[PDB]
Each structure stands twice: as structure tokens, then as C-alpha cells.
Amino acid sequence: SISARNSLPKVAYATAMDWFIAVCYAFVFSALIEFATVNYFTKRGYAWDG
Amino acid sequence: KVVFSTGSYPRLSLSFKLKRNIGYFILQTYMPSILITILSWVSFWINY
């Protein structure tokens, strides 16, 4: 998001590339919240073995 | 007066004694380095 904006001038509105990067950031952050909920609902701390 | 090989020439010189301001560097180099060396001392309290 930083290295995509510097090719543009310092305009005061959001372009379509910014609206792509924002939604992609929302999905990545939602994957983080997904892991947060999964880790909160984790009981035993070991894993599994054959 | 300065002296060259062609003769002696008059000279005026205007000079300034600039002093650098410490405030920018003390928050963008010195303080990050101090806090980063603070962060390394967190390791000494963690279990081995």
C-alpha cells in the first residue's frame, strides 16, 4: 500500500487501485481475526499423533 | 590580501558559524537506538 501510492501524485481522493488494496487488506486482516477466534476456541495445547 | 603567482589581490571574506540542531536526530536516530537496546534486555528475563 505504501509502494503503490508513490507512483501517483499526492492527490486527496482514493483511486480504484486503493479500493483494491483496501479490500485485499480487509481480507488479510479478516484472516488474522479468523486465527484469533480459532486460537481463542482452542482447549488442549498438544496436537495429534498417529 | 591573498598572493598568487600573477600578483597580490584584495580579499573580503564573509563567514557564518552554523550550529546543527540536535532535536531531529535525538528523536529519529538516538531514541530509536536507545529503545531498541532497551528491547534486547527483555530477553534476559525470559525463561531459558
Partner: protein, 160 residues
């Protein structure tokens, strides 16, 4: 003074508010001269830095606050989250300073960066203190989002 359409103007982050013309007599070594001045009132628009440094840093310090939802026995996970947050807070402090010139005094953007940095550093030392105690997580689970929420009401009202 005749301005134009005020839209072909390449003023991007600013916006011409108005103009005022004045005249005065200055005194120099040679003599007194009539000086004519035109003042151009320009007011800035932050929409650019919101996506440059504000939102970006706010989402990093939101990612700082999810460490509390991770269990206390997962030590390398939470310390990896901590070290990544603090190194990227330093990185975003460095990057946002490139747009600013080399001035000595502090700005409101630098004050926001410093408040976010001390917030994430407080989060890391709180997790560290919890780890040394078990060898208050829920207590922070409310306090650390709320302290930034009251800060943003303090920060934006006082500067706007």
C-alpha cells in the same frame, strides 16, 4: 488580482481559500521602497496522509492488540508478533519522516507515531510482565483499546 477556474490549479492536497492584496513601505540600505504583496490563503486536505501514515499505523497498533487473545503459553508466537509490530512501527516512523523536511520540532503526525509506539511498547512489556508472573490479560483486553479510543477523541478535537 484575477484568479482562474481554481480547478486547473495543480494544488492537490491544498485548496485556495481566498486572496488579499496589501501595500507597504520597506526601509533598506539604498532607500525606502514601495512593496506590494498578494497573500494566497491555502488550507490543507489530509485525505492523502490518512492512507499514508494514519490508517496504516492505526491498523498496525490494532494488530498489536490481538496478542491478548493469544494464549499465554504460546511464547514464540506472541514475541514474534511483538517484535514484528515494534520493528514495523520503527519502519513506518522512518518512512513517514521522509515526506517531512528536516525540521527540529515535533509535529502532530510525529506525536501520533510516538503515542502508537509507546502503546505497542506498553503492550509488549505488559505481555512480558504477565509471562514472568505466570512463570491482567483480560484487564488489558479492555484498557488498551479504550486508551487509544479516548486518545483519538483527544487528538482530533484538539488539532481540529
Amino acid at each position: 488580482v484575477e484568479v482562474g477556474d481554481t480547478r486547473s490549479w495543480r494544488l492537490y492536497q491544498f485548496s485556495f481559500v481566498g486572496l488579499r492584496n496589501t501595500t507597504e513601505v520597506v526601509k533598506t540600505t539604498s532607500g525606502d521602497y514601495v512593496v506590494m504583496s498578494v497573500y494566497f490563503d491555502l488550507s490543507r486536505r489530509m485525505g492523502y496522509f490518512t492512507i499514508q501514515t494514519y490508517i496504516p499505523c492505526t491498523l498496525i497498533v490494532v494488530l498489536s492488540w490481538v496478542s491478548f487473545w493469544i494464549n499465554k503459553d504460546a511464547v514464540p508466537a506472541r514475541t514474534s508478533l511483538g517484535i514484528t509490530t515494534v520493528l514495523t512501527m520503527t519502519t513506518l516512523s522512518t518512512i513517514a519522516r521522509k515526506s517531512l523536511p528536516k525540521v527540529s520540532y515535533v509535529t502532530a503526525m510525529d506525536l501520533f507515531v510516538s503515542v502508537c509506539f509507546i502503546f505497542v511498547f506498553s503492550a509488549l512489556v505488559e505481555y512480558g510482565t504477565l509471562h514472568y508472573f505466570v512463570s491482567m490479560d483480560s484487564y488489558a483486553r479492555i484498557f488498551f483499546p479504550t486508551a487509544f479510543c479516548l486518545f483519538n477523541l483527544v487528538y482530533w478535537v484538539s488539532y481540529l
